[PDB]
Amino acid sequence: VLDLLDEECKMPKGSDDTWAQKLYNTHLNKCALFEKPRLSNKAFIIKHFADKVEYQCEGFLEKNKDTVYEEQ
Amino acid sequence: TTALVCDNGSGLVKAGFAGDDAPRAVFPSIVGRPRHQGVMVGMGQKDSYVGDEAQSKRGILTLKYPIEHGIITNWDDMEKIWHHTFYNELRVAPEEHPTLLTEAPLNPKANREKMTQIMFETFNVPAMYVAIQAVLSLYASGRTTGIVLDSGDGVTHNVPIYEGYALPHAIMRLDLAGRDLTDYLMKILTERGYSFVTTAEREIVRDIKEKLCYVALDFENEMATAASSSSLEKSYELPDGQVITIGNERFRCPETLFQPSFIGMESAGIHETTYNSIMKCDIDIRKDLYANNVMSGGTTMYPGIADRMQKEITALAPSTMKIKIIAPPERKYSVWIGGSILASLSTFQQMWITKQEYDEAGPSIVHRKCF
Amino acid sequence: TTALVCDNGSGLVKAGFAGDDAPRAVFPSIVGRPRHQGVMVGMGQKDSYVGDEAQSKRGILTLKYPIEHGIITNWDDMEKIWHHTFYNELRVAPEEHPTLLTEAPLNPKANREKMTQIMFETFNVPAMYVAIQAVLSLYASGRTTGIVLDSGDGVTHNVPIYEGYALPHAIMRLDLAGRDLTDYLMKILTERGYSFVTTAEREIVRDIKEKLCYVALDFENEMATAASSSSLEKSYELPDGQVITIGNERFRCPETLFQPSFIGMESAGIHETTYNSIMKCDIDIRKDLYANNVMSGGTTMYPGIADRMQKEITALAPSTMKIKIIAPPERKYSVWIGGSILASLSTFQQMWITKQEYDEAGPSIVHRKCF
Amino acid sequence: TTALVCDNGSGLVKAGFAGDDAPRAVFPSIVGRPRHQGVMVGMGQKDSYVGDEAQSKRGILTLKYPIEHGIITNWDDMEKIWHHTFYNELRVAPEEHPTLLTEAPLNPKANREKMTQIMFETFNVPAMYVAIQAVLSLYASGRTTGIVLDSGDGVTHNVPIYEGYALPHAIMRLDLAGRDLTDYLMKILTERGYSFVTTAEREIVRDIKEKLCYVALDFENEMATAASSSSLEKSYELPDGQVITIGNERFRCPETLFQPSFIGMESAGIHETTYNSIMKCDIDIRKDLYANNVMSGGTTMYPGIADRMQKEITALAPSTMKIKIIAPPERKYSVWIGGSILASLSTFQQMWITKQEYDEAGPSIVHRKCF
């Protein structure tokens, strides 16, 4: 998940929707611990140690980006 | 729990909750696949698109309509379109809500068998029913008597009804359509030098047919008028910004409904099949059928089709007998509005097929209960 | 391990590590041999020179470009240039790093076969891929839709792409070039009395073309202006300190891209091949192609080529349709920057050709995997 | 007086007198202009060349085809080609003889209007008619029933006919062509390292396509065979005496007719459009259409296209229903032979458009009388 989020940061016209679509392509039925909420396409579920947790995609790419321009 | 009401067709899908005033999800019913080699890496390339997505991307795609002539002709794409309708576009789980489904009359039985089998097995819908389009048009227009004429993409059909009883022997069906009007529009448009070959071009032709066609009140007089003068001739802007000018043809296109001989069929036009359907009814009711003609579905939206119909029936019908055509402006949606009204009724709640009754009888039950 | 990213061409070689912001090694791609009898003893005479060395010595040397028109036309000199690239100029052993290589589209297949065979057998690179220049320009400019126009020394080519799918039938290739602009510059320069015959003189002509040429916005108006006035006329200093003065010719030289009839070809200029490539695309995408035109490679560096292109396409294109030309200042390197971005992506790591797959399938695998 | 019979197309012009067994004048339909500066004085420099002259000189010339896709797209060059046809190459004044002209179906009306206007006004032909190519193929092959498939340079079209009545709704048209097969042949030939850029090179590619291409009976089996073995690989001698070797590609080129997806279109191949055209016919005739398939025009000359068509239709058509393909060796000329037969008939003499009827009705008469 983190490595696809980092790829989506740099890839042009990146978005949270195309990230989520990459999640579903990569994991949706290959890993028992990753799950998609049935009624939505903007979220994913990780079975943690304690509990399942829905994570919303809407924040992720806006928050993940850092690049600090050296001249500044 | 509010039942879902879903109306499939060739062309648009219309879906929403019962008791709503208007459908919540409307989108053209298309499944599209890419036909070019995806060159960029990591794009997130997707197997196929549905509805509005397939419309936006369409330049990349082959567009295939999974229903031709009201028959579902590949069940995988249709099941994709329902999956998109419930989960993506209404965002409501089918395991909560009864569902109501809509079909053209005199269709094959297997279409209902498969449609119920997919609803119970593949979506686990707790209850379902299948209504006739024409019956629902009467609920929408607020009547219990009349001869319905309903024409969409795909099927055109007349169903006479008198105080809530159908007259099965008088039901008529015809395969003139928005679609065959579109293919005729392409084949005639070729005359002026414009060639629309691919499916995504056909969608442009469809938009030309919606925006610019109109039903000539008198055919040969407007033919002579268009030969004499530019005044009838009007122009449209293709997506790339080129302009095309179309002439007499724009009235020539929707008349084929009245004269199927243009597209090459022999069965008479919607006026004469309306008259012949009334004539197949017993003589006492016929006054009330002439008093009510209810139009439905998009192919009856053309400007002037109401007056051309009223005139040409009045020419067919006995001179004393008052002919009236009832064309409500909303009529593109009236089959859905009627389905909403029906599904809301309390008396109807008796009449759903329930999952237990399906498990007992198997998918043939639909013929027994529904119609 | 960071993959290498290497972009060969006629003219400069550009190489560096993936994920860098700009290429670490840039040098003109030349192999040079001495043509004079070495008189001194113990000089340290060397069999042949590569790159910047051949540039410095060049007065002594025959300079040969091992790639003309994007095709490798003697494999020994090309293998020398790769040897210099990996060992001398990047100083990194190829047995550690995947490598990414770049080619113009619609090249012969044998060029990819030989290039992969030499990478696996002669450098033992653990994995390699071959990308299209135009595709990489889209990664660099930050887009997934547009028609790329990319022109270096050797090949000029347009590749339209729409949401990550190429349109192979619409790909155009042309052999106007920095090089044929150079040979035209020599043949026209003769008019004013200056004759640059040898290859090391051609390098001077190339430096004149870089420093002083500019694309006339309107050709005949600037021809009349240069006939009327000195004001357009500008001068340059040969290595020996002589001065030369060049006139109207300095704008006459880069226009041949727009009018190949000057050099003697008949195929229309880069504007009309851009338009013809868009026209070979289906009508729905064309708005987005006109919205994005991406220039790439050094031959698009001339002052005013962006505005001359925008004007002349707008004259070709339907009047309503907004035409935009996207000429980023970096565009000389954008094929490398795009290769760096692509090689950095995590999804791509699936997509390298690996040495095992080569040993199993032989060098023909490149056609299967790469494009 | 013997009427002239003239059959225009993209590619060859075929003209001769009615009642002759074979056309008297056949020459490729090209207008050519010089593109080099004439240096010699008193050469007799000529504004432009037509037909065989433009072929012989062609290395000096830009060659322009005045008909693309069966549409006349610049009327001056077309009028030159008619001038050359009547005066230079038949040497007979048009003011003596009725003329018969030939067109692909479903063309724009303006093409017939202008062609008649130029015949009456500019050549003063006493009478003229315009026939459909497919109809004439049936006269040539000696039948009054069948589905014609006729493919030349430019248009490919199917026209079903049953006992002398056409079935307009079942007419199909496609823009696969000898010409698009040629452009595909150039674009694929590039793979092996051979680049044919200019129009006079395109004429070489056309001659390669004529001499060496053949339709693979089973595509993937011959692809594997050509990958495995040289035995399929054959070589040709360019005009300058260089040799080129072409491999699997020579069968790869004509299959695109069967799989337009190679050139990038989506509409199915000539077999599936033939089947779909039969299916658009009413169910009683279909046996007789399957019994007769008539091929016409040069693009159906490829070795094995007859057997590949018969096999692939038999695979599409119901197994009992006898499929027959009728490919006469003369079929390149059969549209002319049919025009000769028709023009010779006595009943036809009623049916010419006469000059008086043109003066009365204007050039629109052609739509009324001809079809």
Ligand SMILES: C/C1=C\[C@H](C)C[C@H](C)OC(=O)C[C@H](c2ccc(O)cc2)NC(=O)[C@@H](Cc2c(Br)[nH]c3ccccc23)N(C)C(=O)[C@H](C)NC(=O)[C@@H](C)C1
């Ligand atoms: C050769 C013939 C029939 C067929 C090709 C023979 C095959 C064997 O019948 C099938 O079983 C296939 C299929 C079919 C599809 C789904 C299904 O659950 C059951 C059957 N039904 C069809 O293709 C229908 C569809 C249809 C049109 Br549109 N409107 C209609 C109105 C009411 C009912 C159905 C339809 N169709 C196009 C035809 O019949 C055509 C007009 N029929 C003929 O030309 C005659 C000469 C007989």
Ligand SMILES: C/C1=C\[C@H](C)C[C@H](C)OC(=O)C[C@H](c2ccc(O)cc2)NC(=O)[C@@H](Cc2c(Br)[nH]c3ccccc23)N(C)C(=O)[C@H](C)NC(=O)[C@@H](C)C1
């Ligand atoms: C943008 C569009 C149209 C045009 C560019 C819009 C312009 C405005 O139309 C014209 O009026 C010009 C002209 C034309 C030429 C001569 C003439 O006496 C009348 C018109 N006709 C043409 O360029 C034809 C020629 C043609 C091909 Br090949 N087969 C065909 C089959 C039947 C008829 C004609 C043809 N042509 C190439 C096209 O339509 C292309 C395929 N059309 C399209 O992509 C769609 C999306 C609409």
Ligand SMILES: C/C1=C\[C@H](C)C[C@H](C)OC(=O)C[C@H](c2ccc(O)cc2)NC(=O)[C@@H](Cc2c(Br)[nH]c3ccccc23)N(C)C(=O)[C@H](C)NC(=O)[C@@H](C)C1
């Ligand atoms: C006489 C002809 C061909 C040749 C001389 C005949 C010989 C026999 O072909 C070869 O096999 C040699 C070779 C070649 C080189 C390396 C290789 O792994 C395979 C072949 N290819 C070449 O010399 C190419 C290179 C090239 C230019 Br630049 N852009 C191109 C675009 C696409 C592809 C290739 C190219 N080249 C210069 C030509 O074709 C010239 C333009 N062709 C012609 O004038 C016509 C009339 C046909």
Ligand SMILES: Nc1ncnc2c1ncn2[C@@H]1O[C@H](COP(=O)(O)OP(=O)(O)O)[C@@H](O)[C@H]1O
């Ligand atoms: N304003 C309009 N004028 C003419 N035709 C229309 C108009 N709107 C829609 N259509 C055509 O009517 C058909 C759609 O009819 P509709 O009844 O909405 O389909 P459905 O049967 O799926 O409900 C299509 O062919 C569409 O192009």
Ligand SMILES: Nc1ncnc2c1ncn2[C@@H]1O[C@H](COP(=O)(O)OP(=O)(O)O)[C@@H](O)[C@H]1O
């Ligand atoms: N500032 C400039 N103005 C015009 N032409 C230039 C300029 N800089 C380089 N060129 C020319 O562009 C060509 C190099 O293009 P480039 O894309 O860098 O080569 P490559 O294809 O190897 O990357 C050479 O002909 C060079 O002379």
Ligand SMILES: Nc1ncnc2c1ncn2[C@@H]1O[C@H](COP(=O)(O)OP(=O)(O)O)[C@@H](O)[C@H]1O
């Ligand atoms: N024996 C052949 N095999 C394959 N293609 C051929 C053959 N002879 C001619 N052609 C091609 O067919 C086209 C000419 O078709 P034709 O029908 O004769 O032209 P027109 O439409 O002018 O009558 C040209 O592309 C020509 O190169």
Ligand SMILES: [Mg+2]
């Ligand atoms: Mg409807």
Ligand SMILES: [Mg+2]
């Ligand atoms: Mg480059």
Ligand SMILES: [Mg+2]
């Ligand atoms: Mg022909």
